Amino acid sequence: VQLQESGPGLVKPSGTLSLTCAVSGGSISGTNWWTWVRQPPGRGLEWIGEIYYRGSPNYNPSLKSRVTISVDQSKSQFSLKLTSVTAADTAVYYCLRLSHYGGAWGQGTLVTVS
Amino acid sequence: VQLQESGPGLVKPSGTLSLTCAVSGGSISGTNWWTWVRQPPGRGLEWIGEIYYRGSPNYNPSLKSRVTISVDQSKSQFSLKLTSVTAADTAVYYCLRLSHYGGAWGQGTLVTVS
Amino acid sequence: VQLQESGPGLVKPSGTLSLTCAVSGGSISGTNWWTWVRQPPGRGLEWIGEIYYRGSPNYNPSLKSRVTISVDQSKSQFSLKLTSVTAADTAVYYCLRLSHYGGAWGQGTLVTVS
Amino acid sequence: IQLTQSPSSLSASVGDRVTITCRASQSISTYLNWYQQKPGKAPKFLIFSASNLQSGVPSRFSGGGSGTDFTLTISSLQPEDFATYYCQQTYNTPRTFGQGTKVE
Amino acid sequence: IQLTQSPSSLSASVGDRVTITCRASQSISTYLNWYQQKPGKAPKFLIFSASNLQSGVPSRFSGGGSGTDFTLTISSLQPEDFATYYCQQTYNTPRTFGQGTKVE
Amino acid sequence: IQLTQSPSSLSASVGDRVTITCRASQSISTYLNWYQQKPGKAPKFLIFSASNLQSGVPSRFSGGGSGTDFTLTISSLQPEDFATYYCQQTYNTPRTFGQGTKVE
Amino acid sequence: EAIVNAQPKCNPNLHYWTTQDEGAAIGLAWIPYFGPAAEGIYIEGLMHNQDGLICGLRQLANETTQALQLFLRATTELRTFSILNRKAIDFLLQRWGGTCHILGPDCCIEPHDWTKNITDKIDQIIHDFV
Amino acid sequence: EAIVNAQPKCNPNLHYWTTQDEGAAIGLAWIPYFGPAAEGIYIEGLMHNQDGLICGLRQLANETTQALQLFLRATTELRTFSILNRKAIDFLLQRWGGTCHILGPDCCIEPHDWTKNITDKIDQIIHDFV
Amino acid sequence: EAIVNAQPKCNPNLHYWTTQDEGAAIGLAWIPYFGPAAEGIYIEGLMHNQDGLICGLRQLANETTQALQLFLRATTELRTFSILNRKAIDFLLQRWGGTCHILGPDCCIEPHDWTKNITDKIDQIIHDFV
Ligand SMILES: *[C@@H]1O[C@H](CO)[C@@H](O[C@@H]2O[C@H](CO)[C@@H](O[C@@H]3O[C@H](CO)[C@@H](O)[C@H](O)[C@@H]3O)[C@H](O)[C@H]2NC(C)=O)[C@H](O)[C@H]1NC(C)=O
Ligand SMILES: *[C@@H]1O[C@H](CO)[C@@H](O[C@@H]2O[C@H](CO)[C@@H](O[C@@H]3O[C@H](CO)[C@@H](O)[C@H](O)[C@@H]3O)[C@H](O)[C@H]2NC(C)=O)[C@H](O)[C@H]1NC(C)=O
Ligand SMILES: *[C@@H]1O[C@H](CO)[C@@H](O[C@@H]2O[C@H](CO)[C@@H](O[C@@H]3O[C@H](CO)[C@@H](O)[C@H](O)[C@@H]3O)[C@H](O)[C@H]2NC(C)=O)[C@H](O)[C@H]1NC(C)=O
Ligand SMILES: *[C@@H]1O[C@H](CO)[C@@H](O)[C@H](O)[C@H]1NC(C)=O
Ligand SMILES: *[C@@H]1O[C@H](CO)[C@@H](O)[C@H](O)[C@H]1NC(C)=O
Ligand SMILES: *[C@@H]1O[C@H](CO)[C@@H](O)[C@H](O)[C@H]1NC(C)=O
C-alpha cells in the first residue's frame, strides 16, 4: 500500500491550505487509522489529526477550531483543509497510515507562506 | 371423554354452515387442543382450525378469511361457523380432541350442498 | 454518651407538650436510633416514636396523628411535640438511645395535667 | 409444510410384513400421528409421537422414525386390516395430513 | 405485634433461682431487650439480643431464648434486686414492651 | 500527555553501544513508535509496540520498555546511522512525539 | 383469562415456608457470625382457599412446565438465576423499547388530566381578549 | 455507516446451525426423558449473498474482537452470559434514564398526530363561540 | 441528606487502584497473548479531602454493611455479580414501570418548553382570524 501527497507550494495569509493524500494499491477501508503530521524545519514532528474508515474524526487541541479532514472512498483520497492560516505553519507535511502491525509514511510536501 | 357432532344435513349456497361439537364426560379445560377436520369423499383429510381453553384461535390459511371457532364452557360445546359457502366443501366433518398423550375422534356429520 | 431530659412540669388541656432531649459527649450521627418512651405510674412502658440521623421519622399508630419528633444537630438536641393533649398522658417520660450493641436511658421527666 | 406418503396403494396376503412411509419436507423429529380408517366410519388412532401405541390398538403394529423420515410397519397381517391409513405432523400450525395408503 | 409476660407478680427469698418469661405472638428470633427498674428511677439495661449483658450489670443474671420464647433467669438472688422487670422486641416498628413483672 | 526524550544530542564512534530514552508522564505500557529520519527525507520506521522491528530494518537495533520508561539501543554502530530519532505514544489521542535525538 | 383447575383433586390450603425480609432490624442478628444457621431463616404460614385462588395457582404451575423445560434445553448455563430479570427487561422493551404512537393501543399515555391542563389555560388569553 | 469488507476472500454462502424454537408443540418431545439428546436439537440452513450482507457480516466479527477481548480482561466472571442483557439495559438508560427534553435530539417523542389531537378540539369551542 | 462521619478517625487521602479503560488503543497490547499479566493492569492515584467527601465516603461503606449482609443471606448464588444490574432495572421500573400521571410527583415530564411549543402556534390561526 503506497501513499502520495499533493497540493500547492504557496499559500497566502488569511487563506485555506488544501492537501490531497492519494492512496494506491488498496482502499481506505480496514483496521487502518489515517493520520496527518507536520514538521517545520529542523525540529520534531507535530501531530495534527486522524480519521477512521467509518466516521467521527479526531484532532489536536491547539488546532481543533480550524482543521477539517475528509475521506473520499470512490477516488480513495483525503482532503485536509486548514483555515485561517498564519505564518507559523510553513512545514513539510506528511500523511501517515498507522495500523496494528505497522504503518507507512508518505513523501511529504513543502508548504510555505509569503 | 366422549365427543359428539351435531348440525343440519343440508345447506344452501351463499350461506352459513353451523356445527355443534358437544363434549360429555368432562369439560373443555386442560392441556387439550380442540381441532376440526373435514374430509370430502374418497380422499385424505383436511385440517381446518383449532382452539385452546383460554383464547386466540388458530387456523388454516386457505380458509382464514371465512372460518370462526367459538367455545362455550357452561354448556361445554363448540360452535364452528363457516361463511360464504361454496359447492366444494361437502364432506364428512369431524371434531378431534388432541392432547399430549393421545386424542379422540368423534362420529362425523355428513354435510352436502344443493 | 449521656442523655438528659428537660421541659415544663405542668401543661394545660388542649395544649402542646414540648420536650427537649439534650445529648452530651457525642453527636446525633451514627448507627443510633433515638426513641421516646412514656410511663404513666405503676405500669409498663409505652413506646412513642423514634428518629434516625437522616430523615423520615417513625411512630406508634395510636398516637400517629398528633406526635412530631425533630432533631437539631447543631445544638444536638430533640424537640418532641405532642398536640391536642388530654388528661391521659401524665407520666414519667424518657428518651432512650438504642443501638446495635446497647443503648442508654435518660433521667425521665414528670409531666402532669391539671 | 407438506408430507409425502408412499406408496399410494397396496395389496398383500396373510403372513408378510407391510411398510408404509411418511416423509417430511423439513425436520420435525418425533411428530407423527399414524391413523387407521375403514370406509364410512371415523378414524381410530394407531400411533402418536411416531413410536408409542394407544390403548385399544393391537400388539402387531409398530411405528418408527424421526428427523424427516417416518415409517409404519404391520407384522403378520390379518384380513381385518384392510383400511386406509394416514399420518399427521404436529410440529407447527397449520398441521397437515398425508394422502392415504390403501391396504388390501 | 404484642408480647405476653409471665407471671405478673413474684416473691422469693435468698438462695433460689428465679425465672421470668416473655413470649411473642410471632417469630422475631433474637430481639429481646430485658430491663430492670426500681420505683421512681429510670430503667437501667440488663440484656440485649436476648443473651448478652451490658457493661455495668452483675454476673449472676442471664438471658436466653429465640424464635417465639424468651426467658430471663436470676441465680442466687440478693435483697438488692427488688425492682420491676421488662422486655421489648426490636424486630419491627412499632416496638412493644411487656407488662412488668414485680420482684420481691 | 507529553513525553521527555533524553539526551538532546549525541556523538560517538564505531564499536560502542548507544542508548536513547523516551519517558512518559503517565503509564501507557507498550505504546512506543520509534522512528529514524535523515535530513530532507521522510521518516522510516524502526520499532512499534516498543519491542518488535519492522520488515526492512536491520538486525542490530533493539527496543524495549513499558509502563512509563522506554529505551532504544543501537549495538555496533556504523557511519550510516547518523539521523535524527523520534518516539510516539499511541495510547490515546492526541498522540504526541518527542523532541528528537541527533546521532553523529 | 381465568384459570380452570382440571386436576383430579385440589388441596385447598397452602401451608408455606419463605425467608423473613429484614431479618434483623436492631441487634446483632444480621452479622453472620452471630445469626441463625441456614436452617433457621424460614417463616411459615397458612393460606385459605379464598376465591379458589389456591386451586387456580396449582393448575398454573402445571401449565408452565413445558415452556420452562424448553427454556432449559436451549441454555448452556448450569444454574439459571436470571428468568425474572429477563421478564422485567422484556416488560420494559415491550413498552418503551420503541416509538410511542399516541392514542395507539401499545402506548400507555393518558391525557384527560393533561386536557384539563391545556383547557384551563385556554381562558388566560381567550377570555380576556378585549 | 456501511461495512466495507477488507478481507482477502469472502465465502458468499452461510451454511449455519442453530436450535429449533418451540422444539416440541404437542407430543412428549418437550419432556427431557423422552426428547432428543444434546446433539439432536440443531437445525441447519443455507443463506445466500444478497446485498453482500454475508461478506458484510464477516468483517464485523473481525472488528468486534479487540473490544470483546478488552471486556474479558476487566471481569472476574469465569463464564460471561450477560453481555446482551447489559446492552438492553444500556439502551433503556440511554433513552429514558434521564430527563426527556421535548424537541431535543435525544428524546423520541413525535407529536404530529398529537398536534391533530389538539387541533380538532380547537373548533369544539372556538368555532361555536356565538 | 448529608453523611456525617461518626468514626474515631478519618484518613483524609484516598490512595487508590483501578483498571485502565481502553487499555490498548493501537498496538498489540489488547491481544491476550502479548498483553500484560493480571498483575499489571492497574493504575493508581491520589485523591484529596475536598468537601470532606472522602470522610463522607468512609462512613457510607459502614452503613451499607448490614443490608448487604442480609442480601447475601437470601440468595443461593455462590458469587453475586448482578447487584448493579438489578439497581438499574429498579430505577427503570420505578419511573416507567407504571402509569405516568402528568403533573404528579412520580412522573418526570416537564412541559414548559412544550407550553411555548403550543403557544407559538396559537397565533398561526388565532391572530389571522379576519
Ligand atoms: C398437568 O395436568 C395434566 C392434566 O390435564 C396432566 O396430564 C395427565 O398426565 C398423566 C401423566 O401420567 C396422564 O396419565 C397417562 O394417561 C394415559 C391415558 O390414561 C395412560 O396410558 C398412562 O399410563 C398415564 O396414566 C394423563 O393422561 C394426562 N392427561 C392429559 C389430559 O393429558 C399433566 O401430567 C400435568 N403436568 C405435569 C407436569 O404433571
Ligand atoms: C460502623 O460504624 C459504627 C460506629 O457508629 C461501628 O460501631 C461500633 O462497633 C464497635 C465494634 O467493636 C463497637 O465496639 C464495642 O463496644 C462495646 C461497648 O463499648 C464493647 O463492649 C465491645 O467490646 C466493643 O468494643 C461499638 O460500640 C460500635 N458503636 C456503636 C455506636 O454501635 C461499626 O462497627 C461500623 N461498622 C462495621 C461493619 O464495622
Ligand atoms: C481483522 O482483519 C484484519 C485485516 O484488516 C486482520 O489484520 C491482518 O492480520 C494479519 C495477522 O497475521 C496480519 O499479518 C501480519 O502481517 C505482517 C505484515 O505483513 C507480517 O509481518 C506478519 O507475519 C503477519 O503476516 C496483517 O498485517 C493484518 N493486516 C492489517 C492491515 O493489520 C486481522 O487479523 C483480523 N482480525 C482477526 C482477529 O484476525
Ligand atoms: C397544569 O396545571 C396547573 C394547575 O395547578 C397550572 O397551574 C399549570 O400552569 C399547568 N401546567 C402548565 C405547564 O401550564
Ligand atoms: C384524540 O383524538 C380522538 C379522535 O378519535 C378524540 O375523540 C379525542 O378526544 C382526542 N383526545 C383527547 C384527550 O381529547
Ligand atoms: C415546536 O417548535 C418548532 C419551533 O422551532 C415549531 O416549528 C414546531 O412546529 C413545533 N412543533 C409542532 C409539532 O408544531
Q: What is the DSSP string of C12-79?
A: -SSS-EEEEEEEESS-S-SS-EEEEEEE-SSS--EEEEEE-SSS--EE-TTTTTSEEEEEETTTTEEE
d(CA I100, nearest CA chain H) in Å: 13
Ligand nearest to the CA of I102: 4
Q: Report angle CA I35, I36, I39 to the nearest 5 degrees.
A: 155
Q: Which of A28, A53, A101 to mutate to test the interface with H (most CBs of H within 10 A)?
A: A53
CB contact under 8 A, G110 and I122: no
**Which residue on chain G is closest to B52 by alpha carbon?**
G1
> Omega into D7 within 30° of 0, i.e. cis?
yes
Ligand 1: residues whose CB is within 6 Å?
A: B 30-32, 99-101; D 55; G 6, 62, 65
Q: Which of F19, F13, F7, F8 is nearest to F104 (CA)?
A: F13
Chains D and A touch (3+ CB pairs under 8 A): no
The angle, 0 to 180 degrees and rounded to 10, between the axes of the packed helices G83-96 and H83-96 is 40
Q: How far apart are CA G73 and CA G80, in angstroms?
A: 12
**Which residue on chain G is closest to C32 by alpha carbon?**
G26
H95 touching I (Cβ < 8 Å): no
**CB–CB of D8/D99 below 8 Å?**
yes
Ligand nearest to the CA of A26: 3
CA A54–ligand 3 middle distance (angstroms): 19
Q: How far apart are CA E60 and CA H121, in angstroms?
A: 84
CA I13–ligand 2 middle distance (angstroms): 24
Resolution (A): 3.3
Q: Which amino acid is at C67?
A: V
Ligand nearest to the CA of H9: 3
Task: Return the C-alpha cell found at E39.
Answer: 420505683
> What is the DSSP annotation of D14-48?
TTSEEEEEEEESS--SS--EEEEE-TTS--EEEEE
Q: Which of E82, E81, E87, E89 is nearest to E100 (CA)?
A: E87
d(CA A29, nearest CA chain H) in Å: 6
- B chain contacts of residue H28, beta-carbon cutoff 8 Å: 100-101
Q: Which atom of ligand 5 is nearest to the CA of G103?
A: 1
In terms of C-beta density within 10 A (0-12 exposed, 13-18 middle, 19 or more buried), how is residue G55 classed?
Answer: middle
* Chain position carrying cell 432533631: C71
- Return the SS3 of E22: strand
Q: Report angle CA C35, C40, C44 to the nearest 5 degrees.
A: 70
Size of interface B-H (CB pairs under 8 A): 7
User: Exposed e or buried b for every residue in B55-81, given b needs 16+ CB within 10 A?
Assistant: eeeebbeebeeebebebeeeebbbebe
- What is the DSSP code (8-state) at residue E95? P
Q: Which of E88, H34, E11, I29 is nearest to B101 (CA)?
A: H34
Q: How far apart are CA E30 and CA E64, in angstroms?
A: 9
> What is the DSSP annotation of A45-99?
-EEEEEE-SSS--EE-TTTTTSEEEEEETTTTEEEEEE-S--SS--EEEEEEEE-
Q: Which of E42, E39, E49 is nearest to E88 (CA)?
A: E49
- Helix (H) / strand (E) containing I84: helix I83-96
- G chain contacts of residue I92, beta-carbon cutoff 8 Å: 92
Q: How far apart are CA H70 and CA I29, in angstroms?
A: 10
> What is the DSSP annotation of G69-102?
HHHHHH---SS---HHHHHHHHHHHHHHSS---T
Ligand 3: residues whose CB is within 6 Å?
A: A 30-32, 99-101; F 55; H 6, 62, 65
Contacts 24+ apart (CB under 8 A), G104-112: G108/I99, G108/I100, G109/I100, G110/I99, G110/I101, G111/H117, G111/I102
Q: How far apart are CA B73 and CA B79, in angstroms?
A: 11
User: Exposed e or buried b for every residue in I41-50, given b needs 16+ CB within 10 A?
Assistant: beeeeeeeee
**CB–CB of E58/E83 below 8 Å?**
no
User: Exposed e or buried b for every residue in E17-37, given b needs 16+ CB within 10 A?
Assistant: ebebbbebeeebbbbbbbbbb
G4 touching B (Cβ < 8 Å): yes
Specify the residue with its C-alpha closest to ligand 3, atom 13: A101
Ligand 2: residue of C31, C52, C53 to mutate (most ligand atoms within 8 A of CB) is C31
Task: Return the C-alpha cell found at G78.
Answer: 448450569
Size of interface C-I (CB pairs under 8 A): 13
CA E50, E52, E53, E58 torsion: positive or negative? positive
Q: Which of D53, D43, D98, D93 is nearest to D73 (CA)?
A: D53
Nearest to A44 among F44, F94, F98 (CB): F98
* Chain position carrying cell 404512537: G101
Ligand 1: residue of G58, G62, G66 to mutate (most ligand atoms within 8 A of CB) is G62
I26 touching A (Cβ < 8 Å): yes
Q: What are phi and psi of I44, to 5 degrees?
A: -130, 160
**CB–CB of E12/E35 below 8 Å?**
no
Specify the residue with its C-alpha closest to ligand 3, atom 7: A31
CA distances in angstroms from F67 to D5, D43, G39, I20, listed in the order given: 73, 82, 52, 12
Ligand nearest to the CA of G118: 4
- A chain contacts of residue F93, beta-carbon cutoff 8 Å: 50, 58-59
- What is the DSSP code (8-state) at residue D97? B
- Return the SS3 of H124: coil
CA H125–ligand 5 middle distance (angstroms): 15
Q: How far apart are CA E99 and CA E77, in angstroms?
A: 22
- D chain contacts of residue B59, beta-carbon cutoff 8 Å: 93-94
H helix and E strand count, chain H: 3, 2
Q: Which of B31, B52, B100 to mutate to test the interface with H (most CBs of H within 10 A)?
A: B100
Q: How many CB atoms lie within 10 A of CB B109?
A: 19
- E chain contacts of residue C61, beta-carbon cutoff 8 Å: 94
Q: Which amino acid is at A24?
A: S
Residue C26: CB within 6 Å of ligand 2?
A: no
- What is the DSSP code (8-state) at residue I62? H
Q: How far apart are CA A26 and CA A28, in angstroms?
A: 7
